[PDB]
Design a binder for this molecule. Structure first.
Ligand SMILES: OC[C@@H]1O[C@@H](OC2=Cc3c(O)cc(O)cc3O[C@H]2c2ccc(O)cc2)[C@@H](O)[C@H](O)[C@H]1O
Ligand SMILES: OC[C@@H]1O[C@@H](OC2=Cc3c(O)cc(O)cc3O[C@H]2c2ccc(O)cc2)[C@@H](O)[C@H](O)[C@H]1O
Ligand SMILES: Cc1ncc(COP(=O)(O)O)c(C=O)c1O
Ligand SMILES: Cc1ncc(COP(=O)(O)O)c(C=O)c1O
Lengths: 811, 811
């Protein structure tokens, strides 16, 4: 039906129907007469997975015999989403499976809606991991994702009475047809115990054992026949063990609780023991796998960093550094100095945030108890690292205190970021502005000691999931003009600037948007019986709910729009559907209040007969990867409105740009590079830059000043306090008011005026559909930099020391 | 290679090799080069399971369209063992799979050793369930096994320092290739809450929900193309739910603990709340399934007992009676009287023991809390039942007290046996002597009220698992003489009496035994490096360790044999390997002491150079279904030595008889019917009959009398007390001595003298191998009565009201 979806060859189609029917019979043990849509989805999934298998075995045996340098991407999050569509796209089977299912009397897109998200992440860091796996496979890297097979991913969000309610994300209830259990490669992980020092140095003894059972999931490259592996570990009680026999069997649960659930904190450090156990579990099992694979290869650990790269996604797997030192010194019996040389050449660290509340600072007592040998190693790392600091900066005692892996205080803690910098040959931020901030502020001391350590790798997104999968309409009109090479060479989208005056392309770009908006409107109607005006500007802020992301600033604008209509009812305004969605971490009270305020605004705005269909505010329930794939192709305006200096990069920004939305944003994270790529005349940039936030911090942020000088702001704060948006609970939003007036770390009121005025420019442009569409073409055409293929090629060349390849494997 | 194993057709073999290789590639995702024997086992299992699938779908759709009466066998235990061999035998694929694997360079029997027992039972009651499923499928009954999918079956037994140690039976670690998850047919089960009485009668409200997820396993009949279903329920926390979000997700474990582990009590009632929850879980989910299947059939609950039989394996699923009454009255709104008429015509009860410690007597407070509506219904059942008792036996107030479902005392309890008799149209014992005892003693009052209720169904064993699978050598020499109809018509073994003087058959029977003994000796050598003299009489007592089963009496004989050798070293005796095995329930101290005494006797006997290879005592570790299949075909002498009146039936007795062992036993359980079938001249019967035990109970059992009058007994008791068998812990066996001398409920010393003398007759016959073998032929030839096909045909005709059929399904 669509070119970019590939060929429905008569042979391909007849085989797929045959294999579909074989799986329905032998795999599902179902007759055509009793089979539910869920059975049909599973029959298709098994059929599509069969097509991976030959390439999956051949890829791995190609890496065995050719023995390239292996890349290990360690993350406590893989935010993978659904696998069925992505697999069909990367194997060129989408049109064949669509034809095959149609001939069988089935709608493939209804079947796709049955699959559970693999929601094994919180947000950007998690989704980055997932985009990276896709790009490493597409660039033919010998790459392995290593993580935890959480039984429960990020909670399912319900909205009840306008409030977030959390349900368990039981994603494995009907099984996972993609993964292969590898219980034969199960490994032991140790906890607690103590250290004895003997003639053969240190031994870690009297430990409790937890087994790590790996589950392998295929990662297909784009039409290159490469299939890499994501290995996720599952916690299992060891074989051998007052409540007696029954209670001892039930107590197996405690060890298995290690892989039970994803900690739902986005950009926030909660120092829970169980979280620490998850971090060590993934590091200990993974490094045993890496060492085993290293020893059984073509030929001493001198060559270890020429055969191994360990990339640490944030500080979460930071214990890989002391764990690698433990295995090399305590088990392989290397000298400390050689072990340390190997470790630093093997490991690199990615930082994702500058917010102090996000930094991992584990109490020393917890490490003493859980991981006694790791604490000893961390102390020895610290002594030798501070010895090098004293030699470079003699007598700079405060530098010694600031740089230490040990933080003094009521509770002594280990700074895991300091451990990562000390134990890694490369440290990177995730956008140029963030990487510079790292060198200027939080890691200034480390930058001065080792300037060549510090790099930038600007984030990207995979144009497979984030254009070809989610927006086939837009992929199609682009391919019709420039062919298909752009799908793994996204800089070719620059060829689109040649069509900025082409009436046909202009018509087609607006037509695809219109279709995406009618499809999203229909989804909202089907699933939730929510009606939206599809002739409205779709104004979309989707991301985790946080003070720094300033959903509240969006809230102040929505009420401004409502209050201007009530003041001048007869005055024409561009109709808007304002859509906000995202999950609040369960214990983040302010975030849960903000969700309640969005729904409360909706309760007034959406029922005012003076407003009617000119303005709608809706909270999108259960924002996750599959919902991103539906709403982002439907968006006209992308809200990227973080306080300047607070969003390290963002990736949602890059998805919206790729899918034909215009961006309203601050000069923050990758927004700066996106505005540089398209031209700032093609971006709605507003608000304080980093330097203006710093100047305001220097003289003190007084929010009362803004309230006193802006009548429209005062009216809104007064509506919040007096109970206009909570008439039966008039003091409901006291906490939001009090934070905005007195405790606002993110300076919401300081950007209010520039934001409202910038929003006026957005509406002005929207009234001119031709010029709106021409500005959209200028955005899409310059989004190529933001491909994760670009990001990964930089990692491969500048940190891992390996060369990418688009060249195909032979079958 | 062997006729009874079927045809290795060139086409059959080439297909199996093709499907083996397909599963290795697509199912296991493995190359020939990396594949372990475990992978090869799984490739074969998946290949063999594929052959079930067509027959499995067709059988179930045949029952849908033909709508016969359905039989529901409710058991908290299915002791199934391994499935791979049984499946190949029942589909006639054993020789083809053997040839197919041989051509692939693989030993099918090594592959079979990789499969985990489905050890979802304790002993006889559990194994009876399993034999019954096999026979119902072989007799073309529309039968369903309903139970619990325990994550952990009966514990793995290790012997450490001569002591039992329990390990968790992690039978699902590598998956179960036989079962099909049916998460789509998940049902809710309710716990706790309270009852409100409204205008529409009673409602059960404010309950906690646990979901029951069914797993369906195929049950193949013998070469009749019938494939029935065993449905096992798995506990799952409901969708919707101070430790906050993380703790609430971890707390899902508590509801899922319901299907975590099999209670390892054989013939003993432990009143644990979690056990009660398991009983209600299996009853509530099962009866919802039954009611749904009843409503969606060819046509009011009047016809319900013409379409449904519920068979209660012991009192474990006794709550089916009040549960069926709850659904019919509270949900379907039937009058009490009609509901009760339906319930009694639907339900029947099997009793497995007369021992008071085994009877389920649940505290009323526990039922009040867990199952408030069920307690109300049980009270109303009791009132109406005792009203019928008062009318039949006016003024017999003590009869009213003895028959009540309610037992008065410090703790008021419900007698679940009384509930079963009241709520069932049929009650059966499991051997003629046991069924008569029921009518004469524990259920005398009930027999007088309703004599036509009380039946006998003598236990049986499936000659598929217990002859063709385990002893193909013996199956073969029998088929060579009488053909193969005996395999599902076991009374044809009577034709073997024609060969009692045939020199060839006599030679062949002794040759098969000799081969079985060399194969068992080799297994013991391979797995445990234990050496046994294969030219010794194999004297075997395998069953759960209990005082009533009198492993201790076997112990007194072994030491008698040792003490006679030491007294007269030069005197020739028939060499013996004395083998004892079985599990002790973890909390049964006396049972664990007995295991320790068997190993302690071994520690002396097996190292005395005067004894050498003339006598060996060994404890067989981890007695289970797969180990029964190895040792029972190797046995010369079957020990069945329970105190007369205590073993309801036994089934181990019947296995040994089928496999060419002679029996030494009491006139207890089915031993009486086995001696009647073969002729008592062909059995080594000894000891008190029931009437002699009763006479001893009447004047008081004084064990000191026996000790005072039997010098050989006194010597042994003195060896036990003085520390001869525990030299470093001389008082180790004080508890055994004290129980034997003062508290022995099973009168061990009273049968000592007759047992030793009967054992002398066994040895005398063994010295004459021709006459031993002729007596064996007379045993095998008369074992036909003991087929579970015979037992099931009786259930079908005399309780369920359905006609068996050996006729085949068409494909
Ligand atoms: O940001 C400031 C913090 O926010 C809230 O607590 C949490 C912070 C948080 C966040 O800022 C972003 C997230 O994605 C997640 C967060 O989780 C918690 C939290 C607090 C209590 C818990 O039960 C668990 C975590 C506040 O409740 C807390 O007082 C404050 O320290
Ligand atoms: O037979 C007499 C009983 O035996 C032991 O307890 C148990 C009995 C028992 C049995 O006779 C056969 C079995 O298969 C299992 C049995 O389990 C326990 C038992 C006691 C304590 C526990 O922790 C659990 C069960 C004795 O420890 C107990 O004192 C006594 O009442
Ligand atoms: C579900 C989901 N959450 C979060 C993100 C990250 O978005 P942002 O960069 O706006 O936080 C993405 C991308 C996503 O798909
Ligand atoms: C493993 C197992 N345990 C127990 C039994 C029952 O044996 P018995 O009747 O001797 O208790 C059987 C049969 C069996 O196979």
């Amino acid at each position: 039906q669509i070119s970019v979806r590939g060929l429905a060859g008569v042979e391909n189609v007849t085989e797929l129907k045959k294999n579909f029917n074989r799986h329905l019979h032998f795999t599902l043990v179902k007759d055509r007469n009793v089979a539910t849509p869920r059975d049909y989805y599973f029959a298709l999934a098994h059929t599509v997975r069969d097509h991976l298998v030959g390439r999956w075995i051949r890829t791995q045996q190609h890496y065995y015999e050719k023995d390239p340098k292996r890349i290990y991407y360690l993350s406590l999050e893989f935010y993978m989403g659904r696998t069925l569509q992505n697999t069909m796209v990367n194997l060129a089977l989408e049109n064949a499976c669509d034809e095959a299912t149609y001939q069988l009397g089935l709608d493939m897109e209804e079947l796709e809606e049955i699959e559970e998200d693999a929601g094994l992440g919180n947000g950007g860091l998690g989704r980055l991991a997932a985009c990276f796996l896709d790009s490493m496979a597409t660039l033919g890297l010998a790459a392995y994702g290593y993580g935890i097979r959480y039984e429960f991913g990020i909670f399912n969000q319900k909205i009840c009475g306008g409030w977030q309610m959390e349900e368990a994300d039981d994603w494995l209830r009907y099984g996972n047809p993609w993964e292969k259990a590898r219980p034969e490669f199960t490994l032991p992980v140790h906890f607690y115990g103590r250290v004895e020092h003997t003639s053969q140095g240190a031994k870690w003894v009297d430990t409790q054992v937890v087994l790590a059972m790996p589950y392998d999931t295929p990662v297909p490259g784009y039409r290159n026949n490469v299939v890499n592996t994501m290995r996720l570990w599952s916690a299992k009680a060891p074989n051998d063990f007052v409540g007696g026999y029954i209670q001892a069997v039930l107590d197996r649960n405690l060890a298995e609780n290690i892989s039970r659930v994803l900690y739902p904190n986005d950009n926030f450090f909660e120092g829970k023991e169980l979280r620490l156990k998850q971090e060590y579990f993934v590091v200990a099992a993974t490094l045993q796998d890496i060492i085993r694979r290293f020893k059984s290869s073509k030929f001493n650990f001198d060559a270890f960093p020429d055969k191994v790269a360990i990339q640490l996604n944030d500080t979460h797997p930071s214990l890989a550094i002391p764990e690698l030192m433990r295995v090399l010194v305590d088990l392989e019996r290397l000298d400390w100095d050689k072990a340390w040389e190997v470790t630093v050449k093997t490991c690199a660290y990615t930082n994702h945030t500058v917010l102090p509340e996000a930094l991992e600072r584990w109490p020393v007592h917890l490490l003493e108890t859980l991981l006694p040998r790791h604490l000893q190693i961390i102390y020895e790392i610290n002594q030798r690292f501070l010895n090098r600091v004293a030699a470079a900066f003699p007598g700079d005692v405060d530098r010694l205190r600031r740089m230490s892996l040990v933080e003094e205080g009521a509770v002594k803690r280990i700074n895991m970021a300091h451990l990562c910098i000390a134990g890694s040959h490369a440290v990177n931020g995730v956008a140029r502005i963030h990487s510079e901030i790292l060198k200027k502020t939080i890691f200034k001391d480390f930058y001065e000691l080792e300037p060549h350590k510090f790099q930038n790798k600007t984030n990207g997104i995979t144009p497979r999931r984030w254009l070809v999968l989610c927006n086939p309409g837009l992929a199609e009109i682009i391919a019709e003009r420039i062919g298909e090479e752009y799908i793994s060479d996204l800089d070719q989208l620059r060829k689109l600037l040649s069509y900025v005056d082409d009436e046909a392309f202009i018509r087609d770009v607006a037509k695809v948007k219109q279709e995406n908006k009618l499809k999203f409107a229909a989804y909202l109607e089907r699933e939730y019986k929510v009606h939206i005006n599809p002739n409205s500007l779709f104004d979309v802020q989707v991301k985790r709910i946080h003070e720094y992301k300033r959903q509240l600033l969006n809230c102040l604008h929505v009420i401004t729009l409502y209050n201007r209509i009530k003041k001048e009812p007869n005055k024409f305004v561009v109709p808007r559907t304002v859509m906000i969605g995202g999950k609040a971490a369960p214990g983040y009270h302010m975030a849960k209040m903000i969700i309640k305020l969005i729904t409360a605004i909706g309760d007034v705005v959406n029922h005012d007969p003076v407003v009617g269909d000119r303005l709608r505010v809706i909270f999108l329930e259960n924002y996750r990867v599959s919902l991103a794939e539906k709403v982002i192709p439907a968006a006209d305006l992308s809200e990227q409105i973080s306080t300047a200096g607070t969003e390290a990069s963002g990736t949602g920004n890059m998805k919206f740009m790729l899918n034909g939305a215009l961006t309203i944003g601050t000069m923050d994270g990758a927004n700066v590079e996106m505005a540089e790529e398209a031209g700032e005349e093609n971006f709605f940039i507003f608000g304080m830059r980093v330097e203006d936030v710093d100047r305001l911090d220097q003289r003190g942020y007084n929010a009362q000043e803004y309230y006193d000088r802006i009548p429209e702001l005062r009216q809104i704060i007064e509506q919040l306090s007096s109970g206009f948006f909570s008439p039966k609970q008039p003091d409901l939003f006291k906490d939001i008011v009090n934070m905005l007036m007195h405790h606002d770390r993110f300076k919401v009121f300081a950007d209010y005026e520039e934001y409202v005025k910038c929003q006026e420019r957005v509406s002005a442009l929207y009234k001119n559909p031709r010029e709106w569409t021409r500005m959209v073409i200028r955005n899409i055409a310059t989004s190529g930099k933001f491909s994760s293929d670009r990001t990964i090629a930089q990692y491969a060349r500048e940190i891992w020391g390996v060369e990418p390849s688009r060249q195909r494997l032979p079958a």
